[PDB]
Design an enzyme around this catalytic site. Structure first.
Site, short mmCIF file in Angstrom:
data_model
loop_
_atom_site.label_atom_id
_atom_site.label_comp_id
_atom_site.label_asym_id
_atom_site.label_seq_id
_atom_site.Cartn_x
_atom_site.Cartn_y
_atom_site.Cartn_z
N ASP A 82 -2.03 2.07 -4.88
CA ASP A 82 -3.34 2.33 -4.30
C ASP A 82 -4.39 1.43 -4.95
O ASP A 82 -4.13 0.74 -5.94
CB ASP A 82 -3.72 3.80 -4.47
CG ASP A 82 -2.69 4.74 -3.88
OD1 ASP A 82 -1.74 4.26 -3.23
OD2 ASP A 82 -2.82 5.97 -4.08
N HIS A 97 0.80 -1.21 0.00
CA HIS A 97 0.00 0.00 0.00
C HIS A 97 0.84 1.27 0.00
O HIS A 97 0.29 2.35 -0.27
CB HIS A 97 -0.93 0.01 1.21
CG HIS A 97 -2.13 0.88 1.04
ND1 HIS A 97 -2.03 2.23 0.78
CD2 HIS A 97 -3.45 0.60 1.08
CE1 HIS A 97 -3.24 2.74 0.67
NE2 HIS A 97 -4.12 1.77 0.85
#
Lengths: 229, 229, 229, 229
Positions: free
Chosen positions: A206, A202
């Site tokens: 995204d 992450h």
């Protein structure tokens, strides 16, 4: 039983992975009824010069998707993002000693036959234990396969660092799908589906970027003729 | 009318070619009824992001054949044969000023969309007169196309030195072909054929080698799916 | 790769040929549906004592045509035309070392079985590399065959000096031909055609002479029974 | 490429989330064939004064579930559990700059039209970059949507601290469902399903509590008329 010592390093590596990089998963369903026909036809139009599998098509599609969305083909370094251009694919092999990840180089624009040959060579060399460190140290993206075991509908894996993403392909299954007959009534058609699971880091990627990557992969698979592009 | 002077150089070049290199020609007939369907389908499954032609498929097939038979992708130098590994393709463009040969680099493993984009850019840059010498000085293999003119069935060309071979693609035509219906009787089917003419230099290549190259080209075309390989 | 040196001699020879002798080509289409039946029947009416091909019939027909038109069976020497009486036929063989041209002597009035036996012996001796120079130095007329490769429709070759003409035989193909049924309506019949290409030297032979030679060849083939004559 | 610096804060925040709070996931399937009819009817019985989507209904259902089970609408503080009364909903928006989480206040008993208007306002203001910190700092519960991308069957997310839960709504899909015709035989009917994935913090919530929350949500959706309650 005391520990072999080799497992210690893999444990520390996986621990570093899960503690340094948070993980989020995406799960999709592909349709491969045309892909299998293509594989059958190409295997038939041959003289024993080659033999194909589903993993090779998947690897080519991974290369195409990584080229269309280069943010995935990335890493995380000292205060800097290292972005590659080529696609180096780490393929997993399950030896009696454990797990190993040989690498294929320059996938995009390489050819399925060359891919299959390289994969078979590296797999047999891993079963024999005849590899160099450079061959399995590196790679931007990875993959694990379990298609031989029909029970596994889906599964997750862990990001081999310092990479950013990893893929996983379950087994094929039979699923109901609607279809319009020549009249107005709908009907039942049996399509062969596969579940695919992608784990992303992450920090770099995204949700929108991962979704775009998966969309391109699904499109390329469902229209196999786009592999030429 | 006095001569422009530019034609002098091309005349001397072609004279050197024909006097240094003997020429022999090979003429074959292809079948593109499946190729045109493939092109139409790929064009329909798009959002105006690209547009394909026949020359691009031909160039990809040229690269594949050159890689399967590397003796063609060769040259003749001072007491030495220079053999390449990649395929640099010289495409002809007919400007009002005359003829010019831009180059595409690294064809094998590049992709048809990128090929079409590069060809369009180079063609427009040649119509404008905005090229560098390196972009049209080099190349291992060449090609000339006349598909827009439906009258030309076949035609020869001349080997742009120091290369060893060159291609030529006529127009498409309608030809009678036998076909077996479901019963034992034969029938008439109309197939779309093209004549292809390849000129070779005899110092490097022999008739058997040229025939092998042409066989591989015909095979890859008639089975377009092997473009992936 | 440096040059083997053997190719240097062949390059110089071909260069001398093309620079001394102008080349013009004649291309025709034959019909062999009766020839193949004849070959099949002669093969069936045997005890394994022999086995025939198409090249042998072609060589016999070449001898007949050369005798009916002796101007072809000629050469070019120092201010003099050397005309032979017999027909010495140079047959091409494609070894891994390159190309070679053994000779058959006294074709006209020799017999197809003897022709096939001599050709098989010479071909195997060339594959082994066991020839004398006299066996491939000479000959008035030459030929090259590529019938095993079904892709080649037509092709040219180069005149092995000091001869004046050379032949080339493509592959067989299926062609549409009209036919009159018992009624007044026409019909479609599928005939097995071959394209043939003859290269001539223009110092000795003219277009009319070459056309006459080709007409006699076509006649003898299409009526195979005249091989006796 | 150096890091923008803004991503550093988000990475640290997510690292804090995963290292402080464990995560377990629940995955269910909803039926929206009635919800879509309701949305269509309310959209048609309008004069362009409003426009509805699925996210708003989902937000109302989230509020109702949180009120029926207040333990989810909680957090984790210094040796103390902070329990709210209202429902503050953090909606994710994907800008080219990254991700942002505007907030809707007092969802329970607010009205779908007001909800949609506020969400449109905040989304456009985030695309413009015109927000205040209070508008995206706080909130008890969150949500992320990917319904526009039809490829995503399901996905997980990460809990934006100091909250305790987060939701995720996949795309709609076609699924086979049994149905009893007027006679005793069963039949096939095509129902529109969506997969929903909820990630919870285990310090506060237990599996039973999460399951109860999901049951209430499924019930409210499958019977949309209970939104009035």
């Amino acid at each position: 039983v005391p520990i072999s010592g080799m497992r210690k390093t893999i444990a520390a590596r996986l621990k570093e992975s899960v503690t340094e990089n948070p993980h989020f998963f995406v799960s999709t369903n592909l349709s491969v009824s045309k892909l299998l026909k293509l594989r059958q036809a190409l295997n038939s139009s041959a003289d024993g010069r080659y033999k194909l599998s589903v993993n090779d098509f998947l690897i080519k599609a991974m290369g195409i998707a990584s080229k269309r969305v280069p943010t995935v083909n990335s890493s995380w370094r000292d205060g800097v993002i290292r972005q590659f251009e080529t696609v180096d694919v780490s393929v997993a092999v399950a030896t009696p000693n454990g797990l190993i990840t040989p690498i294929v180089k320059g996938v995009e624009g390489k050819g399925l036959e060359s891919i299959s040959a390289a994969v078979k060579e590296l797999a047999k060399k891993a079963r024999d234990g005849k590899l160099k460190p450079e061959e399995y140290q590196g790679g931007s993206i990875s993959i694990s396969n379990m298609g031989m075991n029909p029970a596994v509908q889906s599964f997750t894996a862990i990001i081999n660092p310092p990479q950013a993403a990893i893929l996983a392909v379950g087994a094929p299954q039979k699923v109901a799908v609607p279809v319009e007959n020549e009249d107005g009534t709908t009907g039942v058609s049996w399509d062969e589906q596969i579940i695919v699971t992608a784990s992303f880091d992450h920090k770099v990627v995204d949700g929108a970027v991962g979704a775009e990557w998966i969309r391109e992969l699904k499109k390329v698979i469902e229209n196999p003729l786009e592999l030429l592009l």
